[PDB]
Each structure stands twice: as C-alpha cells, then as structure tokens.
Amino acid sequence: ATSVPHPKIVKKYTKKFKRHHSDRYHRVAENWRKQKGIDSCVRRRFRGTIPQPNIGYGSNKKTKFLNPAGYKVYLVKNVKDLDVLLLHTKSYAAEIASSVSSRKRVEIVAKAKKLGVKVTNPKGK
RNA sequence: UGCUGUAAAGCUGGGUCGAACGGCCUCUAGUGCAGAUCUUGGUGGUAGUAGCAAAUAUUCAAAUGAGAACUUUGAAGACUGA
C-alpha cells in the first residue's frame, strides 16, 4: 500500500458477535452480553451455538488498529489538530469529525493536502 | 455509507433537526436491565370475532331534510286493561 509496509492483515473474526436471542425479542439489543444463566446452552458452549468473544480472537499486534489501507486513523476537529500528524503521514490518517462545519471542513481538507496527510472521509458535507 | 476494538463500545457518509456540546488529566454519584404474577404509560394477536335474541307488532302515504326502518302529520293494525 501507500502507507508504511505491514504484514498482511488477518482478522480472525470478521462477523459481529451478536447477543444471544437478540434475533428473538425486540427488547434484547445486539450489543454483546455474556450469558450467565445456569442452564444456558450458549454459556455451556453446545455444538451449534453462537461463537463468543474471547482473547484468542485478538489481532496481531503489528496490524492492530490499521484500516484496510494500512493507516491508523486519527480524529481531527480543527486545522491545528493536523499538526501532530506532521511526521506520521505514512502511518496515520486524519478523519474529520462529523460536527465540523462545512467552512472548516474545506480548510482542514486544504491543509492536509498541503502537508501530505491522508484524509479518510474527503467527501463530507 | 463505511472504519476500529476479542469485547463492553468508539469514529464516520447520507437523511431529519434547531441551541447547545465534546476530547484529555482528575473528582464525585440517585451510574449500565430481559425478566422481579416488577411500576407507570402506550400497543398487539385474539377479531371485524363473542355478540347487539326477556317485556305480543308493526304497516302505507305525505311533510321536512343533503340524507328518513327510527322525526312530524294523516290513515291503519295492536297493547297496557282502572
């Protein structure tokens, strides 16, 4: 990629860990929750039940936090926030905050181009 | 619309909207819900379903009126039966 070379990015689990029975009742949100019931088939890990988060799924430390382009994304809220990315342009990319006005978003886009900083969401409002 | 995190979650594109709000270092608590025949409010399936069958009984025409089985008048047929 255009960023600093990295090993191939491996995601051990690319699906979303969904809470058990969040498909069954509207009141049960999909935010992950661990089953604590005495009889739970999910907690006892029966064959055929949903996969559950555990530390074995952790990302390789050399590719953790990197987006598909190979950049670590940094939230930028103003022009002066781009300064800390001055020497890290091949490893860090700027993401303009959703609450930045259209006037200031043009200004941040212009400064980033001047400094060579990648912007992850150029096409904002 | 996508991105990050094993995860709790975090960020972002588009739409809606109209007056406040956030990151970081700390402090503090009335701080996290699926259950308690939980509380209050709201809403379903059931379902256009059960049903709207006691007390003999109504009918023709005219008027009115946007509209008349159900209002008024006339003509009948009835009943309460002191």
Contact A121, A98 (CB under 8 A): no
**Number of Cα atoms under 13 Å in the Cβ half of residue A115:** 24
Q: Does A53 contact strand B, using a CB cutoff of 7 Å?
A: yes
Q: Which nucleotides of B are covered by protein (CB under 7 A)?
A: 3-9, 11-15, 34-35
Both tokens of A91, joined, read 């490893």
Q: How far is CA A92 from CA A24, A25, A33, A52, A82, in A?
A: 41, 41, 33, 31, 11
CA distance A35 to A43: 6
Q: What is the 3-state secondary structure (H, E, C) of A4-63?
A: CCCCCCCCCCCCCCCCCCCCCCCCCCCCCCCCCCCCCCCCCCCCCCCCCCCHHHCCCCCC
Both tokens of A13, joined, read 């689990």
Q: Does A37 contact strand B, using a CB cutoff of 7 Å?
A: yes
| Sign, CA torsion A49/A43/A64/A72 | positive
Both tokens of A27, joined, read 């009141």
Both tokens of A92, joined, read 């860090």
The 8-class DSSP code of residue A117 comes to -
- DSSP element (H, E) containing A105: helix A102-115
Both tokens of A103, joined, read 């006037």
Could you give the 3-state DSSP secondary structure of residue A110?
A: helix
CA of A20 to C1' of B42 (A): 27
The method recorded for this entry reads cryo-EM
CA distance A26 to A82: 43
CA of A103 to C1' of B62 (A): 82
Contact A17, A52 (CB under 8 A): yes
Could you give the 3-state DSSP secondary structure of residue A122?
A: coil
Q: What resolution in angstroms, rounded to 1 decimal?
A: 2.3
| Sign, CA torsion A59/A61/A64/A70 | negative
Nearest Cα residue to A90 out of A67, A76, A75, A71: A71
What does DSSP say about strands A92-96 and A72-76: parallel, antiparallel, or unpaired?
Answer: parallel
How many C-beta atoms surround the C-beta of residue A50 within 10 A?
A: 16
CA of A118 to C1' of B56 (A): 97
Q: Does A26 contact strand B, using a CB cutoff of 7 Å?
A: no
